[PDB]
């Protein structure tokens, strides 16, 4: 479930990560 972070319309967002690695 848990959860979250809504990217609303026309709002930029930046991740990469992924804190556990690739």
């Amino acid at each position: 479930t848990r959860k979250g972070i809504h990217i609303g319309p026309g709002r930029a967002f930046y991740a990469t990560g992924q804190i556990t690695g690739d």
Partner: antibody, heavy 127, light 110 residues
Framework: QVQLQESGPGLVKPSETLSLTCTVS????????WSWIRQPPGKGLEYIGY???????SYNPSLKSRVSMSVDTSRNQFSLELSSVTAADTAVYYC?????????????????????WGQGTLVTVSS | QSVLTQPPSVSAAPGQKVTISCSGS????????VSWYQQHPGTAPKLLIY???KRPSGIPDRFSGSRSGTSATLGIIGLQTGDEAEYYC??????????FGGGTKLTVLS
């Protein structure tokens, strides 16, 4: 303000690859996920997939084996590749900017979205 | 039948309340936020509602949506002529895609 524009062939022979490019202006590709969504005439809308500005993708599971998307930061363009097309791929094809829920889980971007659309381009599949 | 279900058709008299219903399941609406689209034929789809009930600016109140349970509903008050179009709902579905309802044709009773 920010405007997207579909481009590519209008007629395509079955079994060949369909290609299209969405061209964006007034804003950067950066920081957004972007999508192609098609519409067979008189039918409703089917989402094909999305691509993240940095290049990561996610393709509708029904088309995944046939579909391919790519993003070109420099040209400010992104693009679609439908393979081995048939009668069923005849549609108006729209490109779009997305929005939705993000998860740090591993499920990443959940697309609920599309606030920005091109005008769409009709593509006819025929021999 | 589709993952999301809408009524193929809905009608009301210029000036009347109407309501379009999007119907789904735990797999989708129980877990993601729906959005709403007006489509006039020959033009692209245009975003009416997002996040169940938020309204992008430029959209008239009188356009309102909401979610309850695994269902969602678009409501159009004070009907007009330019309101005649096809309306879609959409969300993420557990099947791993954005999904649209079949599309409700709203006819304003001339």
């Amino acid at each position: 303000q920010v405007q997207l524009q579909e481009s590519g062939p209008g007629l395509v022979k079955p079994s060949e690859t369909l290609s299209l490019t969405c061209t964006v202006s007034g804003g950067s590709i950066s920081g957004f996920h972007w999508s192609w969504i098609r519409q067979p005439p008189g039918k409703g809308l089917e989402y094909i997939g999305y691509i993240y500005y940095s290049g990561s993708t996610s393709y509708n599971p029904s088309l995944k084996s046939r579909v391919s998307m790519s993003v070109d930061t420099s040209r400010n363009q992104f693009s679609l590749e439908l393979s081995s097309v048939t009668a069923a791929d005849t549609a108006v094809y729209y490109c779009a900017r997305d929005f939705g829920e993000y998860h740090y889980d591993g499920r990443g971007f959940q697309c609920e979205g599309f606030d920005l659309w091109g005008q769409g381009t009709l593509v006819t599949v025929s021999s | 039948q589709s993952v999301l279900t809408q009524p193929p058709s809905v009608s009301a008299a210029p000036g009347q309340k109407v309501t379009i219903s999007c119907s789904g399941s735990s797999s989708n609406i129980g877990n993601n936020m729906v959005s709403w689209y007006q489509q006039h034929p020959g033009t692209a789809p245009k975003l009416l509602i997002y996040e169940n009930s938020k309204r992008p600016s430029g959209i008239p109140d009188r356009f309102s949506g909401s979610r309850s349970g695994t269902s969602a509903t678009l409501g159009i008050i004070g009907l007009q002529t330019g309101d005649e179009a096809e309306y879609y709902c959409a969300t993420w579905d557990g099947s791993l895609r954005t999904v649209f309802g079949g599309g409700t044709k709203l006819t304003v009773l001339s």
